[PDB]
Amino acid sequence: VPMHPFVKALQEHFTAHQNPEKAEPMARYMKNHFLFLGIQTPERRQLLKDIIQIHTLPDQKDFQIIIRELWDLPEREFQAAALDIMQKYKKHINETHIPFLEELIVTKSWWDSVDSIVPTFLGDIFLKHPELISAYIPKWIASDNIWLQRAAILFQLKYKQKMDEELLFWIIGQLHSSKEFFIQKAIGWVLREYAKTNPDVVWEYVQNNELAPLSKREAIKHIKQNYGINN
DNA sequence: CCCGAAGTCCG
DNA sequence: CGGACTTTCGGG
Numbered sequence: 001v002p003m004h005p006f007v008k009a010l011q012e013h014f015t016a017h018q019n020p021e022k023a024e025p026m027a028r029y030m031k032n033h034f035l036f037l038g039i040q041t042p043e044r045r046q047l048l049k050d051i052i053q054i055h056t057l058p059d060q061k062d063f064q065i066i067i068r069e070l071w072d073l074p075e076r077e078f079q080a081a082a083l084d085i086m087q088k089y090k091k092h093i094n095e096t097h098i099p100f101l102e103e104l105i106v107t108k109s110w111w112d113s114v115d116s117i118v119p120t121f122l123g124d125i126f127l128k129h130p131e132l133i134s135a136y137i138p139k140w141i142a143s144d145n146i147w148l149q150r151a152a153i154l155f156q157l158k159y160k161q162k163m164d165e166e167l168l169f170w171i172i173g174q175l176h177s178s179k180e181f182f183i184q185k186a187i188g189w190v191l192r193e194y195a196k197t198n199p200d201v202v203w204e205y206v207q208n209n210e211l212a213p214l215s216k217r218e219a220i221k222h223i224k225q226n227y228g229i230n231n
Numbered sequence: 232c233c234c235g236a237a238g239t240c241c242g
Numbered sequence: 243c244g245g246a247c248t249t250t251c252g253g254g
């Protein structure tokens with residue numbers, strides 16, 4: 001079965017504009033886990049738009065197929081484009097897509113893909129269907145996969161007043177002893193972000209519960225100005 | 232335009 | 243460990 005024509009067209013058009021000189025530092029930035037074509041976001045967005053203009057966005061029946069096929073291509077720009085495409089199908093994504101999103105998280109995994117899946121796509125799903133959180137979060141925390149653990153921490157990133165504080169702090173407590181940078185830093189980020197909404201709760205939490213030094217320092221980067229640094 | 236959100240280098 | 247500094251991206 002041939003590659004979906006939309007994917008083939010995107011592959012041809014991106015490849016015709018590759019920049020091997022830029023690809024080298026771009027690949028190093030992601031610690032050489034991926035090949036890059038060397039196309040930065042502004043041009044990558046225009047090249048995708050070119051293909052949508054010519055071919056039209058595929059029928060929704062092929063949404064998951066297109067994303068998978070792009071996920072399977074070697075160069076990282078194809079996963080970035082896949083996430084751009086998934087946003088275009090946003091109004092068609094719902095709770096039945098959680099496993100599909102899980103599988104994207106755990107394949108071709110790094111912060112650049114995971115952080116564009118979790119707080120937006122999964123965040124929106126669990127905001128509408130909070131009763132489904134306990135069908136996934138416990139498994140994610142218990143798994144060997146650091147990106148699922150990071151997903152458990154960051155899905156509520158943007159919740160603001162809708163943050164489930166007890167849940168957030170329970171998740172952090174489960175993962176606070178992790179030596180993994182991407183876990184320590186995710187804890188730092190979610191606390192720093194939630195502190196923009198409820199600084200007193202975050203301050204009390206970090207002063208009275210164990211965290212990796214990195215996590216605590218990142219959490220209070222801004223709010224330490226409000227409370228002061230005791231001698 | 233601005234600001235706030237991985238990476239290297241150094242003590 | 244953590245400060246100083248870097249580019250790229252998204253949002254205001």
Ligand SMILES: Cc1cnc(N)c2[nH]cnc12
Nearest residue numbers: 235236237238249250251
């Ligand atoms: C995630 C992140 C944080 N801070 C910066 N100064 C960055 N520059 C590029 N990504 C960044």
